Enzyme design. Structure first.
Site, PDB file in Angstrom:
ATOM      1  N   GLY A   1      15.364  -0.229 -44.467  1.00  0.00           N
ATOM      2  CA  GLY A   1      14.840   0.884 -44.312  1.00  0.00           C
ATOM      3  C   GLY A   1      13.360   0.439 -44.737  1.00  0.00           C
ATOM      4  CB  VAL A   2      10.355   2.475 -44.683  1.00  0.00           C
ATOM      5  CG1 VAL A   2      10.989   3.776 -45.005  1.00  0.00           C
ATOM      6  CG2 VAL A   2       8.788   2.472 -45.256  1.00  0.00           C
ATOM      7  CB  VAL A   3       9.221  -1.498 -48.614  1.00  0.00           C
ATOM      8  CG1 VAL A   3       8.767  -1.985 -50.054  1.00  0.00           C
ATOM      9  CG2 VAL A   3      10.652  -2.214 -48.347  1.00  0.00           C
TER      10      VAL A   3
ATOM     11  CD  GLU B   1       8.654  -7.595 -61.603  1.00  0.00           C
ATOM     12  OE1 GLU B   1       9.762  -7.957 -61.333  1.00  0.00           O
ATOM     13  OE2 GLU B   1       7.574  -8.561 -62.226  1.00  0.00           O
TER      14      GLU B   1
ATOM     15  N   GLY C   1       6.015  -2.776 -45.859  1.00  0.00           N
ATOM     16  CA  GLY C   1       7.086  -3.640 -45.297  1.00  0.00           C
ATOM     17  C   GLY C   1       8.351  -2.613 -44.750  1.00  0.00           C
TER      18      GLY C   1
ATOM     19  CG  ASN D   1      13.365 -12.321 -48.687  1.00  0.00           C
ATOM     20  OD1 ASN D   1      13.432 -13.251 -48.985  1.00  0.00           O
ATOM     21  ND2 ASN D   1      14.231 -11.893 -47.855  1.00  0.00           N
TER      22      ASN D   1
ATOM     23  CG  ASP E   1      17.721 -11.740 -44.249  1.00  0.00           C
ATOM     24  OD1 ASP E   1      17.607 -12.784 -43.782  1.00  0.00           O
ATOM     25  OD2 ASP E   1      17.462 -10.641 -44.132  1.00  0.00           O
TER      26      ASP E   1
ATOM     27  CG  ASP F   1       4.599 -11.816 -47.751  1.00  0.00           C
ATOM     28  OD1 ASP F   1       3.902 -12.677 -47.079  1.00  0.00           O
ATOM     29  OD2 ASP F   1       4.952 -10.606 -47.127  1.00  0.00           O
TER      30      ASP F   1
HETATM   31  N1  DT1 Z   1       2.469  -8.624 -46.979  1.00  0.00           N
HETATM   32  S1  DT1 Z   1       1.848  -8.672 -48.227  1.00  0.00           S
HETATM   33  O1  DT1 Z   1       1.498  -9.935 -48.756  1.00  0.00           O
HETATM   34  O2  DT1 Z   1       0.375  -7.855 -48.770  1.00  0.00           O
HETATM   35  C1  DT1 Z   1       2.746  -7.872 -49.513  1.00  0.00           C
HETATM   36  C2  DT1 Z   1       4.079  -8.253 -49.612  1.00  0.00           C
HETATM   37  C3  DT1 Z   1       4.974  -7.798 -50.262  1.00  0.00           C
HETATM   38  C4  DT1 Z   1       4.502  -6.871 -51.281  1.00  0.00           C
HETATM   39  N2  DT1 Z   1       5.243  -6.106 -52.292  1.00  0.00           N
HETATM   40  C5  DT1 Z   1       6.816  -6.211 -52.117  1.00  0.00           C
HETATM   41  C6  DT1 Z   1       7.364  -5.901 -50.709  1.00  0.00           C
HETATM   42  C7  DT1 Z   1       8.748  -5.845 -50.563  1.00  0.00           C
HETATM   43  O3  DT1 Z   1       9.250  -5.798 -49.505  1.00  0.00           O
HETATM   44  C8  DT1 Z   1      10.037  -7.131 -49.235  1.00  0.00           C
HETATM   45  C9  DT1 Z   1      10.187  -7.101 -47.731  1.00  0.00           C
HETATM   46  C10 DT1 Z   1      11.343  -8.221 -47.500  1.00  0.00           C
HETATM   47  C11 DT1 Z   1      11.424  -8.604 -46.224  1.00  0.00           C
HETATM   48  C12 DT1 Z   1      11.755  -7.318 -45.269  1.00  0.00           C
HETATM   49  C13 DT1 Z   1      10.636  -6.183 -45.311  1.00  0.00           C
HETATM   50  C14 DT1 Z   1      10.699  -5.913 -47.004  1.00  0.00           C
HETATM   51  N3  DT1 Z   1       9.501  -5.762 -51.707  1.00  0.00           N
HETATM   52  C15 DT1 Z   1       8.911  -5.733 -52.975  1.00  0.00           C
HETATM   53  N4  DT1 Z   1       9.389  -5.684 -54.309  1.00  0.00           N
HETATM   54  C16 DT1 Z   1       8.264  -5.894 -55.038  1.00  0.00           C
HETATM   55  N5  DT1 Z   1       7.139  -5.897 -54.325  1.00  0.00           N
HETATM   56  N6  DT1 Z   1       7.519  -5.761 -53.189  1.00  0.00           N
HETATM   57  C17 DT1 Z   1       3.206  -6.301 -51.084  1.00  0.00           C
HETATM   58  C18 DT1 Z   1       2.289  -6.757 -50.436  1.00  0.00           C
END
Ligand code: DT1
EC number: 2.7.11.22
Length: 292
Positions: A16-18, A75, A11, A126, A121, A80
């Site tokens: 920033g980047v995740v 965690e 994401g 999220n 947001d 999502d």
């Molecule tokens: N697109 S997906 O269903 O494969 C997916 C979504 C989310 C995640 N994991 C994730 C993603 C994430 O990023 C959240 C987003 C919120 C919207 C803006 C980009 C980041 N924060 C997190 N905290 C714990 N796990 N986690 C893993 C896979």
């Protein structure tokens, strides 16, 4: 950062980047977020977030403030709600599971609201789900820390779809009611399998809300006409029936959404009150069908 092995990008937020990452020492699989920007108040706000622990809030495991850079270690959750909605598109998420998910998010919201912490947001991306039937809020409190811009670092346009009208009309003081509004938007999208208000500019967003809910006036929203971006010249649309808006949501469901979507934030239902709403009389916790 060097204590983590990146596995994959998962994401890109307003901050920033995740990455999915693994802790080189303990073996822990985490979501690692490098924050783009560290100001002393961001440090202090973020450190408050570390204490705000709840089963329906994605656990902030660590804040790494190193080499004048900032990493948040969360965690890890595998999916999502957007991806899950898209995968459940042909028949919809079953209502019992919609209800369980709405019920848990409201618990997480009631929790953070009671500590005076807002999300600001909320959106399908999220809201994160596991194989145990749980749903969790990600990035809680981060907007109050680094600011929601129009574009992300990668130029991606931020959604307006879940934005509360008091924000769109330029109120500078957000209340917890903005989260209820977004969560109401998400509720409607779960039920109908369509976004409720998919605006692609602020005025488009506003005018989509007005077309569905009636242009707001002094009757339904005392003060609306004196808000910074309110214009008398706004067209005056009449409200539509919720019956028309979220079929086949039942009457308890429709009555709650209506309270989550009240124009005046002061009349909008609280997370705690919504938890006592009859819609949850028969709540359960189903396990979803998740492909990972
Ligand atoms: N697109 S997906 O269903 O494969 C997916 C979504 C989310 C995640 N994991 C994730 C993603 C994430 O990023 C959240 C987003 C919120 C919207 C803006 C980009 C980041 N924060 C997190 N905290 C714990 N796990 N986690 C893993 C896979």
């Amino acid at each position: 950062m060097e204590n983590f092995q990146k596995v994959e990008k998962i994401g890109e937020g307003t901050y920033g980047v995740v990455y999915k990452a693994r802790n080189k020492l303990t073996g822990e699989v985490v979501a690692l977020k490098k924050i783009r920007l560290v100001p002393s108040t961001a440090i202090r706000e973020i450190s408050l977030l570390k204490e705000l622990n709840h089963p329906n809030i994605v656990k902030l495991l660590d804040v790494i403030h190193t080499e004048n850079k900032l990493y948040l270690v969360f965690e890890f959750l595998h999916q999502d709600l957007k991806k899950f909605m898209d995968a459940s598109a042909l028949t919809g998420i079953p209502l019992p599971l919609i209800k369980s998910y709405l019920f848990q998010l409201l618990q997480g919201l009631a929790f953070c609201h009671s500590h005076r912490v807002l999300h600001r947001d909320l959106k399908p991306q999220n809201l994160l789900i596991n194989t145990e039937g749980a749903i969790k809020l990600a990035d809680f409190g981060l907007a109050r820390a680094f600011g929601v811009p129009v574009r992300t670092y990668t130029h991606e346009v931020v959604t307006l779809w879940y934005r509360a009208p008091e924000i769109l009309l330029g109120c500078k003081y957000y209340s917890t009611a903005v989260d209820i509004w977004s969560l109401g938007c998400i509720f409607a999208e779960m039920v109908t399998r369509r976004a409720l208000f998919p605006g692609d500019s602020e005025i488009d967003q506003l005018f989509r809300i007005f077309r569905t809910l009636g242009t707001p006036d002094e009757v339904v929203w005392p003060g609306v006409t004196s808000m910074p971006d309110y214009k008398p010249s706004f067209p005056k649309w009449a409200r539509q029936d919720f019956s028309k808006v979220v079929p086949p949501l039942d009457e308890d469901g429709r009555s709650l959404l209506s309270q989550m979507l009240h124009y005046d934030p002061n009349k909008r239902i609280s997370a705690k009150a919504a938890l006592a709403h009859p819609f949850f009389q028969d709540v359960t916790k189903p396990v979803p069908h998740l492909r990972l």
